[PDB]
Amino acid sequence: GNFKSKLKKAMLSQQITKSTIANKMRLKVLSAREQSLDGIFEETKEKLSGIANNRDEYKPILQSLIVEALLKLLEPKAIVKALERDVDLIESMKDDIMREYGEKAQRAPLEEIVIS
Amino acid sequence: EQKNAGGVGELEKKAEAGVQGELAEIKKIAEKKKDDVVKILIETVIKPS
Amino acid sequence: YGAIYSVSGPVVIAENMIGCAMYELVKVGHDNLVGEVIRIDGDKATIQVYEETAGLTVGDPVLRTGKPLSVELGPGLMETIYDGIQRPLKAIKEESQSIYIPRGIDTPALDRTIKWQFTPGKFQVGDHISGGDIYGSVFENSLISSHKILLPPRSRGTITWIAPAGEYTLDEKILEVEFDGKKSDFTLYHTWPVRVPRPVTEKLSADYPLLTGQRVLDALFPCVQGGTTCIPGAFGCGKTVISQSLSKYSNSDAIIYVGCGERGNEMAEVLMEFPELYTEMSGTKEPIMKRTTLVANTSNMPVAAREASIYTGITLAEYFRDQGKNVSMIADSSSRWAEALREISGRLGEMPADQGFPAYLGAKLASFYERAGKAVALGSPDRTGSVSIVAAVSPAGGDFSDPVTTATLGITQVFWGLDKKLAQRKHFPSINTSVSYSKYTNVLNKFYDSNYPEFPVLRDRMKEILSNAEELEQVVQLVGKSALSDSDKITLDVATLIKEDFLQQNGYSTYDAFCPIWKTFDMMRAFISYHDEAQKAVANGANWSKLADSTGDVKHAVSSSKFFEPSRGEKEVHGEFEKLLSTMQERFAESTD
Amino acid sequence: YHSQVVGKIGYIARCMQTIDPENNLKKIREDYQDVLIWAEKNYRFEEILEASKSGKCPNDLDALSRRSLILLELLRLVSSISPFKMKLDLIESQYEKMKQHVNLWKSDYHVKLNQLNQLTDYLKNAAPTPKNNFLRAMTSVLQMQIAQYGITEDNEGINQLFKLGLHLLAMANEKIDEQYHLFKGYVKDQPEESPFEGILPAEDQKILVKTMIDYAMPKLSSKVLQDKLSALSSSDVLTKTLLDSIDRIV
Amino acid sequence: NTVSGVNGPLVILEKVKFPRYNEIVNLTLPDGTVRQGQVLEIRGDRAIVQVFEGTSGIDVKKTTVEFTGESLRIPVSEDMLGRIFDGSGRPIDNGPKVFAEDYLDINGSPINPYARIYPEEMISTGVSAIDTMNSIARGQKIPIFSASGLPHNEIAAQICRQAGLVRPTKDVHDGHEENFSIVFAAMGVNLETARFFKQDFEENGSLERTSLFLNLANDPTIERIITPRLALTTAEYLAYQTERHVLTILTDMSSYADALREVSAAREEVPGRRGYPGYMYTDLSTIYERAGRVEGRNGSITQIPILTMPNDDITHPIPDLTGYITEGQIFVDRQLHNKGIYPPINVLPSLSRLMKSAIGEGMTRKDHGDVSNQLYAKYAIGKDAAAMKAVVGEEALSIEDKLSLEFLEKFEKTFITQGAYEDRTVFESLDQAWSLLRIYPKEMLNRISPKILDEFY
Amino acid sequence: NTVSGVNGPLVILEKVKFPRYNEIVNLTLPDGTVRQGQVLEIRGDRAIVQVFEGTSGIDVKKTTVEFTGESLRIPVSEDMLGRIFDGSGRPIDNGPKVFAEDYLDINGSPINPYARIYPEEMISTGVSAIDTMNSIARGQKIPIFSASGLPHNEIAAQICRQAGLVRPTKDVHDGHEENFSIVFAAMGVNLETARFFKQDFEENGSLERTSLFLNLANDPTIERIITPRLALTTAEYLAYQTERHVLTILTDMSSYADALREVSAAREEVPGRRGYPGYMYTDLSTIYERAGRVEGRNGSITQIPILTMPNDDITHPIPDLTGYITEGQIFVDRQLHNKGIYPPINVLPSLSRLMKSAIGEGMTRKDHGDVSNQLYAKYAIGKDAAAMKAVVGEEALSIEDKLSLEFLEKFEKTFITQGAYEDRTVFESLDQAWSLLRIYPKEMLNRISPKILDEFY
Description:
This is part of a larger assembly, with 1 copy of chain A, 1 copy of chain B, 1 copy of chain C, 1 copy of chain D and 2 copies of chain E. Chain A has a domain at about 40-115: ATP synthase, E subunit, C-terminal (hypothetical protein PF0899 fold, 2-Layer Sandwich), CATH 3.30.2320. Helices cover about 65% and strands about 5% of the residues of chain A. Chain A is built from 4 helices and 2 strands. In chain A, strands 1-2 form a two-stranded parallel ribbon. In chain A, α2 (about 60-70) packs across α4. Chain B is rod-shaped. The termini of chain B are far apart. Chain C contains 19 helices and 26 strands. Chain C is globular, with a radius of gyration of 28 Å. Classes of the chains: A mainly alpha, B mainly alpha, C alpha+beta, D mainly alpha, E alpha/beta. Chain B: One of its GO terms (biological process) is proton transmembrane transport.
């Protein structure tokens, strides 16, 4: 009876280690999938940062981004906070951002752009 | 009890032999097909989401 | 910062809320009275006051402390009595000349009249640091220091400046951390919220084989460090003698005494009775007072200190468990904090619940039992820690069927009863096997049986023998003793000697308040071998008077072996119990033939 | 989550570099090369946390807690055996034997190192008494036997010296007869001729023999026993023949 | 100066926010009667205060308002004995003023003097069964539980009137070596009971050592609930400043519980279960926080609260909340009071949890602990023998049930039986219990030592 | 805009009405911490949402707001088995990634895939008393009713640990035609119970096929009440995606009822009786609404929740409201557990409404229902005969009470006794139940057909 009890205890410990190996394999698979997702997100974040350095081509995406972000506020006066290399693009496209924002919102159109 | 507790490297050898070469095809397929989703993800950031 | 807008009842309202959170505690008025903003309604903040609001007019200033209401962790914690709100009674007795907290008086959370010597650990200039790592050592006692200087949890960086060895105050800084520039100044005392649990490395099941100094309690059930167990009380029916005898007779590194809603009579008797006792850890430097932490709040104090007393004691026990030591947390009781939560909820304006208890008592009761436990210590060192929670239960609604004891009995996994006749009989504790249970005896008997235990076979046969003798006592009383079997008289005689020698304990000597596991296992194995040899000798043909008169000095000598020293075999084994098996086998062989 | 793994990696690399300043733990540093590679290069904690959160580094807190506890026990075992340093091969074999056991709360090496650290820590704030000197000599002989025989092998002298040190530490200042009888029985039960030669100083052995000679000297009112016992006090080395000759006269 | 309205006992007046919380205010009406009160709450040009004299009869746009500028406090002095006062600290004898020398707060704790000493040095107050079996000492509290079937106000007036006479006989036994005083607090009592208790206390010669506080049942609840604060501050100031043992008696707890339950009818706070408020533990803890051993214990501040249950049910938090904070409880049976015994207290359900700590050597009897356990076991065996005697009969009753039944009937009319104007100490109660216990044999007495049992049989 | 105030666990912040019901929003604090929650209340110029991180410490004017614009959804995938996560669905407990190939919103049902037929397949758990007395189906739910003081975690750990060995023998009997999965969600449990359940699941060998959801009492109640919907949605998505019968365990029910019953006094809603809210029936019925047959006719969802009573009374809204929604229940008696029979789950008040549809002619015996009903009537008749025989004794004991008490003792000590890992079949339990039920006479048995009685006694 005691030998059968010890054999049952060893038969449980073997299944415990067999569960631990199956946990380690899924840990390695998650350790590869995280590096794959990080490898895709690094290429996406570098592809956006490469196109973000433009000056004469970033005004239409910045106007659509300010016009898209202006729809979630619904105010006649909004402050635009950006970097030092993008204040001239918003200042040179504030009339296009107000004209593009006024065409998609008749309840509260923007009057002036505040460059902080 | 000595046949299931011998050595602390059997759990790593039992998991490295399961997926040690198959991960290069899954990572090679994602790294090869990453340019198809990177173009749509890069194009979606330049448009109104 | 803010101004007093209006005051209605015991809660004061302060306006000018321009960023003050609803979790930080501040002092309203120039008196610096204790208070905390439980909620906010618009610009005005609703703050609950746990004291008299006399002398507070409209237009008083409100200044926040800059952090939530919690306890401070620093050196010099042993041999000191404080409240749940960081209020030392020793400074109030020196300055105000009173014991109770007076209105318009404020004291520091840490005693600035005693300084300790700080020593550098294994951290050099430019070394990496993390939360929970041992940065040094601080002296907390005149004999041995146990206050480990560690960094705060949820933080990391590089040690840019390390102070040298020497004595310094708690207010002065001794270390500086550099993480993303000038992070902040570091001192000996650290902050920790009482409503936030302390972090750890990893939690595990309670399987640490640690004793608490109870011979009958450890013999009836295996004691472990990190489990949850509740004890029923009657407001001074024997729970104070079991808590004081358990804390004094315990051999752990630290002891946590928490008085939440006591009457005040047992608090002075525990503090004055704690230094007169003699500890069993090889030292005489006031070990009963210096080796334990005393946090006592009476019934004439605010509800914030009594409700936060168990959270501060559990936070100090969590800090001692995170330091790499096992501490025992004994708090009596949760009924005063549960009644204080309904009293604060009724005055603040909370809705009622079933049995007059609030809805947060169910989550707070599970969080209180889930706060303590045995696991790996947090930090780079990875030390072993444990926190044993011993909470007393009493009625607070008019009966013992309240939701506090009912939810606490279902949440806890161990129950220890307490009979009034056994407490009147000078037996402490008087719990029986038929009025108690425990599921954690498999792990404690597995590890303690893994070292050199015989507790499982003697414990199962001892519990079955006590359960058979308890059922046979009513049949022997009602039916009589002239019609029962001879094995029932030997089982009742062995249960009377085992219950008299094991349950009978009131701290008569140093050997009665601290018994080893091998002495209790050999004492229960001698009684189980005597009952089995008496049943085997009576089964083969023999008289009860021939065996009882045939034993003689063996039965009286086996009961008087608990008053001697335990160093008989090597340093802790009983040598008289080992030689009793040959006399019991010779008496069993002589009684049969 | 990531801060505990970065703190365990930095504390593992700093503890591994602070443990051995000669770079002789190639077997222990071989398994910890993935954590020492981040410590051997200039990198901030935010880069290690961001690299560990993105699946580019180790994020197993369960393996780092057990490896940090085994490295802390190996550093505490070497630090507690000062100045009797052990060999690098014995530390590597003890690190492999401790690494071959998954339990870190039931092993005898952790309880033996905790009891040796508590016995050595208890002698720091102790005065120069006879039980503190005998417990200090037994702690020095237990440190020399622990440094010579390791902690991965069971020995009768290490368990007997640990039980005698725990029994001597468990005593008080009113059991000098039991501490002197335990020191005489432990000194007579030793198999070697001199257990204090080349370990303790000559003044500690002469004070140890002078404690038993001074204790047995005022207990006898005979001039022959005091005169014969007075000649044995000029021995600067402790031996079993001096204790047997002093016990034969008393 | 502009009363907004009145709802219940609290009046809502419109005034400035310059007055502090609990400040005294004078309301001048157009009838010619000035009434004082306390401000319950202060807000931004709005507040609700409770008037001490009356709650109605003031104008809305014709009355005047005035602020005194002082907080609610009663002057504590040593000349408070031998006079009659009210629940707000005003004498009703029409004589001299208080003439106090220190400013003590009545709505809070001035210094909160509570020493951390254990209970010891027990002194008696005139009860043989109460001071004998469940005798409390300085520092410990013991409440009295009664119902609507006995004169609990006359029992509190007889217990307060019985105090002070045991100090001369106890002074020779080393039980009291200082001046003794009594604190009498009456809330919700009538003029006949207060005049009968004042004439009964003045007839025995104890009016010059106790204080008289009479509160009528037609006053506000703020004065009835604030009436025990002046007695607690007077007993703490007399016990701490004078170093004398003072006993505080507060009756009744049902009037304070009904006055506290009647309050909060126009605020955000709501009552708990059973119609009572949920903050009764803080209200009882506030009155219990101003009693006990002060720092530097020379005297004692004893608190003996008398609570009378209006329904005799155990489902209320009045007796459970009051008995849970204290250590012990005393119960009164209506069957003992219906027979003619005074006081009709029962020692069977009553028990003391700190009786061994209160008794010692030099201030109490040695055999008082074993005599109370032997009298309690003889009373329980006499109750079981008296209950089994009716079923068993007279010709089939046992000798133990008849011997215990005679000791129960003789002890019920001898030990519990006392005089209204007679003072019996614990030494005379132990000698009277020894005569009732002398009928049993020496073999049937095993709850005492052989030397004390042989010397005192 | 900014946060107006905070009352209880929910935070009342002021903002525009652009967000919808159940819209995910993010609150920015000035201490460098971000908290996410769901908009439970939307009004004009104000909103009331419950945050899943923290319950206190929210700024008033120093906080910022950020609109996510996406509804609350749980990411479920086909690889969620074999990972550890928290109650909020985060991989911070050393488990696998929380990434998912599919994302579906929840509003009470993912697609509303309710079954339109009765369940025919029967799932065996490895207990002769549980599976024999209550025929569990592939879509039927049967919770375990326990009390404070009974091993409910050992019964749930034995029932979950029994899955893995009885399923291969039951798969050959045509009781299951696909792989089985486990969904474990802990709420309001200790660390020793979760470590014991994870240690029993790892020792049983089902660590890679089960899910780990850890929720403690120190976390927010909104995440603890939202964890069972995400666990049931992930188990329903895995069972619908894989076509496998998944068994979900919801323990404890008192923590989930205490989480929704916790926020009942800090809101504008009027709660019901016993302190709980009036919408507890919809929240309790929402967990049972996601049980039944799945789409495809090859998958189903099994519900086996663990309910622990906080007072030990059978007259409660949690046990009656929770047991009234489900089909039957398994009650655990303290008398059976006190005697020593494992498990203590009795079959006296236990019953199954779909026991006839769960049993057939290819996976179970045809006479199992008649022997189960005759054994169920003989168990209550033996309990009433043992209760009447215990009070009456042996002077007026009936002849049928001795055979009923003998069959109740032999059936309670033979059929109720079973190990924690010993496998047992329903065919051997019916054959032993026929031999144990064969001691009764033919005239007494009248609840079975004559062909089944003539075929086997």
